[PDB]
Structure 1
Amino acid sequence: ASETFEFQAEITQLMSLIINTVYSNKEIFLRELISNASDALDKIRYKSLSDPKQLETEPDLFIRITPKPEQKVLEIRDSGIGMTKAELINNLGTIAKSGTKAFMEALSAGADVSMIGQFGVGFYSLFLVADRVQVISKSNDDEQYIWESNAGGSFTVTLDEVNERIGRGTILRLFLKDDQLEYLEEKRIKEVIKRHSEFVAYPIQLVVTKEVE
């Protein structure tokens, strides 16, 4: 059984603005999600300084990008600290985020949408290219859960009994908009990554499915 929660009003407002904006540089979403993945990895690494056992659930620290053409899905995975059920609810929707309103006010004044990360709400930039998202996460402190949103005022959280087991970490499964399928292409993904992420300390793995000649 899934549980439904209401987003903090300002977040709903932000998602509506982002999912509908005709901003030209939509590729910035990848930079923001890679940045968030890197931060999550930094967190588990730092925590492991005094609790080495924390890494055992998934010894490899990585960021992985997996296009799923048939499903028109793009997944961004990391083996970071992950989020418990409580953290998914709090961090992604119910708790008011400091820069949410501030960012929208900046946008109204003319700020570039690319500044979203500096306001601490870069996660929501995913709606530039997707109309739905499932955040699948596994924290060492809880079971695996699925947080889902379609930019609407409510989101759901469900105990995960349908996706692959992740040792520890988070998967952002983006359901791409019909006109943003270019982000399923290896060449396109590679150029975007190489452009806004040169100083990422973790390996960025691209999973490519090729037909054997």
Structure 2
Amino acid sequence: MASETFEFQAEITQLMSLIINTVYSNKEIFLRELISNASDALDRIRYKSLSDPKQLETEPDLFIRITPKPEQKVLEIRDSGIGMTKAELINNLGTIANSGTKAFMEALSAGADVSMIGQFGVGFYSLFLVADRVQVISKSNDDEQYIWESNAGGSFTVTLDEVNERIGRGTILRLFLKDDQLEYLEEKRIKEVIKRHSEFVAYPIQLVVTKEVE
């Protein structure tokens, strides 16, 4: 329908600024963070399902799926985890500074590896290493499908989703890659990052590859 617009908490805006404007070299850790987040979302729905089995019926398969969309310069990271409601997207992705935002920034300026970002509970924002824009598309059993969108600006939008494929249940991180980071559309490069930083993931990690038939 129509978008609602929200302002980022001052700390989160600062964090995004740091990250988006970094010379940092090890940018590939963004994928470890998103996969770990995906894995956590999958842990949640599975634990929930222990005493509420019906929760799984909206998407019985538990998986992490990565889909490069080279034409649009887009990389998607999807999971069939618990998903997030409209209120969760608003409350947890910007309007309330995470418990570790300022501390991570303090740590960063002291010499800390950007890769520590996950230990501070703000690793979602690492996607800004390789992307200048992001849509978080999410369907929780408890709500309708919604789109959360940010370009690292000081505000984000949340919109009821009438334009994307239905996700049964879970979350798509749709990354609009920067022009210098298009290597992450490549099958070989993706595979390599996964093997190096994400060896111990309990769920299948699927890669969607689009090849011309000869």
Confirm or deny a common fold (TM above 0.5).
Answer: yes
List 4+ stretches of structure 1 deviating above 6 A: none
Q: Could you tell me how far 1:62 is from its partner in structure 2? A: 0.1
* Whole-Å separation in 2 of the counterparts to 1:56 and 1:26: 37
Give the number of aligned pairs.
Answer: 213
Q: Secondary structure at the match of 2:179?
A: coil
CA offset digits 1:74-126 (Å, max 9, x no partner): 00000000000000001111112110000000011100100000000000000
Paired position in structure 2 for 1:110: 111
Structure 1: gaps of 5 or more residues: none
* Whole-Å separation in 1 of the counterparts to 2:108 and 2:180: 24
Q: Secondary structure at the match of 1:98?
A: coil
Q: Could you tell me how far 1:153 is from its partner in structure 2? A: 0.5
CA offset digits 1:29-76 (Å, max 9, x no partner): 000000000000000000000000000000000000000000000000
TM-score normalised according to structure 2 size? 0.99
CA offset digits 1:153-211 (Å, max 9, x no partner): 00000000000000000000000000000000000000000000010000000000011
Identity across aligned pairs (percent)?
Answer: 99
Q: Secondary structure at the match of 2:147?
A: strand
* Whole-Å separation in 1 of the counterparts to 2:186 and 2:199: 20
Paired position in structure 2 for 1:73: 74
* Whole-Å separation in 2 of the counterparts to 1:144 and 1:181: 28
Q: Secondary structure at the match of 1:133?
A: strand
Paired position in structure 2 for 1:16: 17
* Whole-Å separation in 2 of the counterparts to 1:133 and 1:72: 12
Q: Secondary structure at the match of 2:94?
A: helix
* Whole-Å separation in 1 of the counterparts to 2:138 and 2:171: 4
TM-score normalised according to structure 1 size? 1.00
* Whole-Å separation in 2 of the counterparts to 1:123 and 1:79: 17
Q: CA RMSD in A?
A: 0.4
Q: Secondary structure at the match of 1:93?
A: coil
Q: Secondary structure at the match of 1:148?
A: strand
